[PDB]
Assembly symmetry: D2
Homo-oligomer: 367 residues x 4
């Protein structure tokens, strides 16, 4: 199942994702035609059961997919990763049978695209201190703003978090299935970022936004728990993204390595260079196992600490690629390594900054 998934995703990736990725780096435009295709090829709901219209696979297979896709494109990797793990799964895992049946099949097929609306200008690490309010009068009425929202403006469904009980803090947060055509719900301009060219990261404005009471992702007050619960599987995905990034750095670096001659010998013949390659390879084998064991735990097990470790390790390891080995050429947009640095750095920041991850990890230890 898994060996087959990997080969399927590798071939698709190389054939379809590779050309699209170069267009994304050049255009900075969300790959609407690619997403669609990935949808037809059954990539958009991989750890979703067949009941609700997905591929009926796991978890390792799903994370595996994200790993493989991220080799070729970190952007597409995060789009897929968010879509499923925090755009679809919250419904799958905390939603009711009616909602699962209404919302997931279109998400699974890829006819619909998923988003995760947690972060706010004032709340972003301290996600507990979010300010968006949801006041009920069988219609919830949402007010406030989100920031840095992956899949912004492409997305049809936004899993959105909003205060139902403001005088409780982290405990008074509820979670909502928000549809894109919601009356006072607006999307901000595409944010201009260091990297993940292609992605589509936007602000969201909620102005007395009318969200149906039935779209409450239940029950009221559970939202903070819902968020973090999924962010765990999400973080393994980010780690897998970081992994793919790092492998792409390595493979490119080896081949260039190797071919490129200076001082009468290929640059690789120099230990200054070869030792980097080995270090890259070693930290990538380290990262690999952190990621897949974390995903194997989740595939009924407490996996939170392991997922934090993976995210932090892979991300930091990935940034450690750095461009240098390509030399001057590596500083060039026409060559394939400069993107890996730009893209890498994100991995240390979102779905929980590495400062937070160390904090979380340390909390398990001091337990």
């Amino acid at each position: 199942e898994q060996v087959m998934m990997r080969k399927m995703v590798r071939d698709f990736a190389r054939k379809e994702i590779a050309p699209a990725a170069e267009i994304m780096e050049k255009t900075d435009e969300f790959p609407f035609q690619l997403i669609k295709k990935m949808g037809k090829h059954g990539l958009m709901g991989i750890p979703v059961p067949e009941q609700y219209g997905g591929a009926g696979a796991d978890v390792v297979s799903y994370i595996l997919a994200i790993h493989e896709i991220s080799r070729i494109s970190a952007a597409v990797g995060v789009i897929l990763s968010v879509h499923t793990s925090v755009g679809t799964n919250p419904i799958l895992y905390f939603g009711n049978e009616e909602q699962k049946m209404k919302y997931i099949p279109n998400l699974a097929s890829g006819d619909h695209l998923g988003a995760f609306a947690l972060t706010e200008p004032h709340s972003g690490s301290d996600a507990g201190s979010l300010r968006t309010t949801a006041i009920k009068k069988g219609k919830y009425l949402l007010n406030g703003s989100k920031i840095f929202i992956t899949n912004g403006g492409a997305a049809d469904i936004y899993i959105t978090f909003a205060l139902t009980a403001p005088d409780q803090g982290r405990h008074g947060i509820s979670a909502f299935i928000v549809e894109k055509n919601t009356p006072g719900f607006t999307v901000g301009k595409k944010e201009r970022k260091l990297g993940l060219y292609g992605s589509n990261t936007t602000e969201l404005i909620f102005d007395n936004a009318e969200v149906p009471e039935a779209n409450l992702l239940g029950k009221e007050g559970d939202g903070f728990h819902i968020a973090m619960a999924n962010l765990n599987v999400g973080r393994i995905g980010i780690a897998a993204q970081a992994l793919g990034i790092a492998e792409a750095a390595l493979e490119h670096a080896v081949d260039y390595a190797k071919q490129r001659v200076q001082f009468g010998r290929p640059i690789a013949a120099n230990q200054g260079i070869s030792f980097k390659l080995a270090d890259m390879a070693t930290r990538a084998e380290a990262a690999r196992h952190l990621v897949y064991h974390a995903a194997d735990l989740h595939n009924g097990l407490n996996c939170g600490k392991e997922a934090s470790m993976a995210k932090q390790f892979a991300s930091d390891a990935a940034v450690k690629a750095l461009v240098q080995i390509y030399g001057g050429y590596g500083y060039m947009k026409d060559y394939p390594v400069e993107r890996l640095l730009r893209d890498a750095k994100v991995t240390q920041i979102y779905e929980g900054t590495n400062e937070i991850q160390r904090l979380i990890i340390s909390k398990y230890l001091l337990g």
Copy 2:
């Protein structure tokens, strides 16, 4: 005094002129022709003597300029750095009295802009193995081949160009040439699209039976490799200073943001996870500062400074790239082009690569250690 005055003068200029220009450069990716001109009028274009039309100041003052300019703009810092250290100085130090007089005043004033042509598709780190030939025919040298990754490319009026006069001698058969931009058969390639240094024109150069006057031969035939490396030393201290400025900008921005930004009921700075980064940044910037200025003080005293300059380049550069932290301290906001830290990373990484990759620098340093 001269130095303390230079520093304040360059700080004020940078801030009023270089700061607006720098944002235009990050948006347009266009060489800042106007700023350069202005910098020219304000006598920044520094370690040249007054005889030949410069500011008559010393190397510390000059490096100190590059440092300060690089706080605001690494791009403008390298353009300046190249122009002087490797576009102007080779003439100043190895050229003859006639050439000094002909070429330098316009370079010094900033009426003319300087470039340094060494690197080639097949020759970079191993600069010895360059392939551009210069064959004397008819009292004119006749240049053939190509250069790559040339800073100041297409803006520059003078290109200090290195080319084989004696191909069978390898590194020992390289000569150095004062090439003028309007030279027959000398052509400039398209602006290269880079990770960073946004405003700084980096281009290819095509030499097609390019006719260079015999009188533009810079020093004796075969001296070119020595000339190159000799200046690359002062050039490397400048790169280090660039890396320093980059790093200081990262720090200052990071401190301010970290003080103001509140999460968990406290400013983010109150967290040792964060504050400790800042301290590390500050400490490695204090380390870097002294490497740079002692290296420049050695050179100012006419002394052997090669090893120290390598150390500075490698230290500051690596330390600067370590303002991945600044991005982190802002971030998500740090990942955003509207905020001022993402450029520092993009710009930082180059410092590890050009005027001698840090692999080369460690190699060089190690060669001093081993002797012998």
Copy 3:
């Protein structure tokens, strides 16, 4: 070490370790004397031939269980961990894997039981990293091989009864003319040097060996002449996973001690752990130890099930370097960590070895890089 079973071995070694190895280890740190009595005991408790089959008088277990043992023992004592590791992986296994049925029967049961102790004899003053360029000669004469030259830095030196010894047959062939020999300790002309005084692994006996027309029986030739280099490296792979497991145990001890101390120790009105300066080290320690764990056990799972050389190199380098990074543990105890009466200072001293023997980390990166550039 997941995903059996092997859960029984781990508990068995953990209990033994804590009960018997712990007191012995404090004596070793104080005395610097090889723990003859512990070894004996470990022998009775069936720890001395774990991945040896039952046929030849061992425990009949697999390589994960074995490496697992070494991991557990090294939590308490890195010294005793290496003594065990060498004994089995390079003192007993070369016979097991390359020796003949008669030799296996003669030499292994006593090694397996722990009645006899094993050693590895490769390194020489002039050949270490470049083990190929060893100079000890083995010249067949009379009715006997005749060995000449010297070994250095030999773990289990003077305690050991059997020394798996490598010597030139074969001088004009370099690395291809090396042979391997089962050398017994009471061999005429074979002498042991004084106990070497080391930074750490107190007291894992490390000695010089002098070979003076040393008379080794032809029947003690381990496999075919010229196979010795191959035999050495082949085992050094399983050996390196063991060294990695040693580094792992070291690192986990650093962590566990560091956590406990950091929670209890109060300064500025709060436990030191409440400071991110401190907690973040702990998290890093824990994270790199999870990373290391998987490198080690997957490497050993490959070997249990395949080509494992690259993975073993990765593990050895990763765990070793990670381990030296405690050193944070010393720091976390503060002044007290610099003290011989407290339990962290030994972890540093011990750690550093793990970067050096059974193939320095410079060599390991080289090896790894050779698989990449292939």
Copy 4:
């Protein structure tokens, strides 16, 4: 006119043999100290008035740097003696200066600094040793720990709680003499390294201290930290010397030692370490000397930076590795450098504290 040259020659001639005896014996080098005394190395930044080489703080720190190339142990003994055993008297202490310093300066007397306690270290403010005046003689009670120069020392600059309800603000500083009634020294500690710099516990049992009150009551915390600044530059200089010894040894060995048909140095794996070592030692050198030049000519942030940088850089002479198996051996000269190095990250303010302090200047 700055020697070095004097301290380098002395070091190599006298300190080198002594240092090998110290590593073997773990015994405080009483005879060397005496000699260093005669050669005018004890009291370097002390004025001549008080007996006194009459030199400046660069020349002093320079001395410590040079000595630490060869020893570390001897370096810290000297460093504590002067910067925190003698200087507190010199800077906070006319009658007392005259009584106590000349013997300290000459090296007839040896100096110590008694701040740290089992319960107070990094948080030195929360010390528990009490000093209660009864009547007109102070009466000291409690314990110190980890005291450099312990049992060799004649004078102990001791800190002790004159106003217990004021915490950090109720600490006083005392000139304690070794023959004081009720003042006892604990057993030699036995450490990872700095073999044998005597490090001991001190027991204060109704210990009778006179006029030996150092400055005004309540000033003790300020006195301590004030000196700990110059002390920290010294520690940095110690870390520097350690690092330079690692480098020089590593270069020579790496050039001579042949494997794979070429000297090990020919390998970039190895050479690159050497270069990094050299580069971080040049970095460290300037941090140290600029910090000391500031103090000579305030200097707190720079001294913290130096201590942290040099110390961490020095520990990074784990790169032992270059000597290989030989480096793990007590007969070879690099294993000591690691063992010794680690201390430099810990005492006179752990590097966690130093980052904290530095960060306080940044955020202020």
